[PDB]
Amino acid sequence: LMKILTERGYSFVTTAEREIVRDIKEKLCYVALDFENEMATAASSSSLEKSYELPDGQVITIGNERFRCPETLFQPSFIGMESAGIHETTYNSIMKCDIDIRKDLYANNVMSGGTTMYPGIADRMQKEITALAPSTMKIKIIAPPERKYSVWIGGSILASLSTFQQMWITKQEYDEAGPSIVHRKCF
Amino acid sequence: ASFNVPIIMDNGTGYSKLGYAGNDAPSYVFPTVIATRSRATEDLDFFIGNDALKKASAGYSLDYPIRHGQIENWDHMERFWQQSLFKYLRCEPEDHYFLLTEPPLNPPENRENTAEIMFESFNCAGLYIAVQAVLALAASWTSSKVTDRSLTGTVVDSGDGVTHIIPVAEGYVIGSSIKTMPLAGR
Numbered sequence A: 001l002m003k004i005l006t007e008r009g010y011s012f013v014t015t016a017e018r019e020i021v022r023d024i025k026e027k028l029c030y031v032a033l034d035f036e037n038e039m040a041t042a043a044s045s046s047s048l049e050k051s052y053e054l055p056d057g058q059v060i061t062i063g064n065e066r067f068r069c070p071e072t073l074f075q076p077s078f079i080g081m082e083s084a085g086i087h088e089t090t091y092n093s094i095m096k097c098d099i100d101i102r103k104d105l106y107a108n109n110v111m112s113g114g115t116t117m118y119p120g121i122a123d124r125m126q127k128e129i130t131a132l133a134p135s136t137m138k139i140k141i142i143a144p145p146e147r148k149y150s151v152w153i154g155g156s157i158l159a160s161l162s163t164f165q166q167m168w169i170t171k172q173e174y175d176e177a178g179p180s181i182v183h184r185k186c187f
Numbered sequence B: 001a002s003f004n005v006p007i008i009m010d011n012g013t014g015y016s017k018l019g020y021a022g023n024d025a026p027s028y029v030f031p032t033v034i035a036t037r038s039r040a041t042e043d044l045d046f047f048i049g050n051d052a053l054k055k056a057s058a059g060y061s062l063d064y065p066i067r068h069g070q071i072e073n074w075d076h077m078e079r080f081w082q083q084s085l086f087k088y089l090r091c092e093p094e095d096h097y098f099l100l101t102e103p104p105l106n107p108p109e110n111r112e113n114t115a116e117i118m119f120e121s122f123n124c125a126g127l128y129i130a131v132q133a134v135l136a137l138a139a140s141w142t143s144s145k146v147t148d149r150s151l152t153g154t155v156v157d158s159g160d161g162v163t164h165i166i167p168v169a170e171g172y173v174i175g176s177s178i179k180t181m182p183l184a185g186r
C-alpha cells in the first residue's frame, strides 16, 4: 500500500507514516468480489473512491488502491512472489490430506487472523474455492464476527480445562530437563 | 532352615541404595529416576538410574518417583522396583527377605500401598519397614563388637528431599519430639 500510494502522489517514508498508512488500510480497504470487472468499473470513478483525513489535515483520495492492495493475497505475484494465493493454497492443503476427510474439510473453513477482517473477503474466498473444487459438494466458509481475537479466545478456552493442568511445563521439570522440555512436551 | 541373605532396599528422594546384608558397601548407588516414553510395547520401554541418565535425549522423558520423601506416582515406583530387582539386584522375590526403608511422618496410605505392591506384584517371603533414622543410630557406632553401642542420642538426617531430626533414648524413639524441616539438598 505504501508503494502504490506513491503513484497516486502522496509519499509515506518513515515508520510513523507506516503506522499512518496502516491506519488508512484499517478502514479504507476491502476485497472485491470480482477483480477484472471492478478494475474496469473503477474507470468511471463514482462510488469507489472516498476521502481520508490524514493526521496533518490534508485529505487523501484513494481509488483503485482501496481494493488493489488486498488483492495481493490472492495474487502474490504483485509483490514479486512465485507463490499461490490463499485461495489456491487452501485447496492445495486440502488435497494434500486423505481422500475421505476432504469432504468434511470443504464444509468447515475457519477464517482467522486480523488480516481477514477485510469487508468482503469471505465471499471472494468462497467463490474461488468453489471454482477450484469439484462442483458436487458444498463449500462453507466460517467468518465469525469476532474472529479478530479468535486465537486468544481459543487459548482462554483451552487454559480453563481440567485435563490441561497435566500438560503444563512445571518449573521443576524445566529446571531438571533444560530448555528442550518444550520440544519434549509442547509439540 | 538356612535362609538366604536379606536384601537391604533404600529409596531416597535423590539416590536409591540397594545392596545385601553383610556386605561392606552398597552394590548400587544410582539416582532414583526412571526414563519413560510418552517394537517393544510402551509397557516395558523404561530405563532407570545411570542408564536412564545417559538415555535422556534419545527419546525418553525422565521423572522422579520420590519427592520430599513421599511417593506420589505409583506406576513409576513399581516399575522402578521391578527393574531394580530383575535387572541389577538379580534376585527371585519368593526366596528372600526384604528390608525396606522410608522416611517418617509418611501417611499410612503410602505404607499400605508399598506393602500391597510388594506382597502382590512380587509376593516376597517377608517385608520389613524401618524408619530412615534408626539405621543411622545403628551405624553410628564403629567398633560395634559386643557392648559399645550408644543407644541414646540424636540423629540429624539431612538428605536430598527432606531433613529429619529424630531423638532416641535407650533405643526407643520419642515420637512427641519428632520435628521435620522441608528443606534439603534439592
Ligand SMILES: Nc1ncnc2c1ncn2[C@@H]1O[C@H](COP(=O)(O)OP(=O)(O)O)[C@@H](O)[C@H]1O
Residues within 6 Å of the ligand: B011, B012, B013, B014, B015, B016, B158, B159, B160, B161, B162, B185, B186
Ligand atoms: N558431598 C556432598 N555435599 C553436599 N551435599 C551432597 C553431597 N553429595 C551429595 N549431596 C546431596 O545430598 C543428598 C543426600 O544424599 P542421599 O542421602 O543419598 O539422598 P536421599 O536423601 O535422597 O536419600 C544427595 O542426593 C545430594 O543432593
Ligand SMILES: [Mg+2]
Residues within 6 Å of the ligand: B012, B013, B132, B158, B159, B160, B161, B162
Ligand atoms: Mg534421604
